[PDB]
């Protein structure tokens, strides 16, 4: 859609920040499209990832961090509020102790901070979606 | 790059046909980009898949078919001739008994026919690549 994908934006986060994303999968769920949102420690795509959020639409969500180049403890959820063929609105709120992910207004995933959110310098949104809105509160 | 991704083209295949794809991953291998090539039985994206070829660059290749809407027996290979950050040339040749996948001129994967290649009506190339060339011999 309107915004380029992969989408990369410099960003700063702290308690009270919200990252809001509006988009739509590029394929029906039967084709297992992905969505990925990564909060990076530098502008470079190979930099460490404070928060990795990966949806396989219709299947599961995996969350992790990538520290000194290595993936850490994967977390998995089978919660799937995303609807086949539909636009979604995804909100990621920075709470004192965790990220909270809302999908279409419903609390759907959380992820305890492994690294301070202040380490984030960049957000990348990519894989099999079109993107119409991306916003970071400041 | 030049061709739209996801890329969809109507196609007919038989013994002696070759599908040639030139492209480049959109991310470094550390970010686990995917490439997927699906030979479909109809133009519709949800149609059955005679040959499903999915690369997770730097990790593995999975191959399968999707018959009457259900994924069948997955095959997996850890062969990884693709090079981090590089353009690749992918050739899929239709042999009497199998598909043969060449990567940068080297035989890299094969997949025995589960359904006659004559059932193919469409090829889709998608996931995390840019595409500069797509050709089906006729």
From Swiss-Prot, chains A, B:
Keywords, in A-Z order: Acetylation, Cytoplasm, Lectin
Domain (Galectin): residue spans on this chain: 5-137
InterPro entries, A to Z: ConA-like_dom_sf, Galectin-like, Galectin_CRD
Major subcellular site: cytoplasm
Pfam families reported in the protein's UniProt record: Gal-bind_lectin
Molecular function GO labels: carbohydrate binding; identical protein binding
Tissue expression summary: Expressed abundantly in the bone marrow. Expressed exclusively by eosinophils and basophils. Not detected in monocytes and neutrophils. Expressed in CD25-positive regulatory T-cells (Treg) (at protein level). Found in intestinal tissue from patients with Celiac disease, expression is directly related to the histological grade of mucosal damage and to the number of eosinophils found in the duodenal lesion (at protein level). Found in sputum of patients with eosinophilic inflammatory diseases such as asthma (at protein level).
SMART domains: Gal-bind_lectin (SM00908), GLECT (SM00276)
Residue list for modification N-acetylserine: 1
PROSITE patterns, alphabetized: GALECTIN (PS51304)
Other comments on record: Forms hexagonal bipyramidal crystals, known as Charcot-Leyden crystals, in tissues and secretions from sites of eosinophil-associated inflammation and some myeloid leukemias.
Subunit structure, as described in the record: Interacts with CEL.
PANTHER family documented for this protein: GALACTOSIDE-BINDING SOLUBLE LECTIN 13-RELATED, GALECTIN
UniProt name for this protein: Galectin-10
Organism: Homo sapiens
Gene this protein is translated from: CLC
């Amino acid at each position: 859609s309107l915004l380029p994908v992969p989408y990369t934006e410099a960003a700063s986060l702290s308690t009270g920040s919200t990252v809001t994303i509006k988009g739509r999968p590029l394929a029906c769920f039967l084709n297992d499209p992905y969505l990925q949102v990564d909060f990076h420690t530098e502008m470079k795509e190979e930099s460490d990832i404070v928060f990795h959020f990966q949806v396989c639409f219709g299947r599961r969500v995996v969350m992790n961090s990538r520290e000194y180049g290595a993936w850490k403890q994967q977390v998995e959820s089978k919660n799937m509020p995303f609807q086949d063929g539909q636009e979604f609105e995804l909100s990621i709120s920075v709470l004192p102790d965790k990220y909270q992910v809302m999908v279409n207004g419903q609390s759907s995933y959380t992820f305890d901070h492994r690294i301070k959110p202040e380490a984030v310098k960049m957000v990348q949104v990519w894989r099999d979606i079109s993107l119409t809105k991306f916003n970071v509160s400041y």
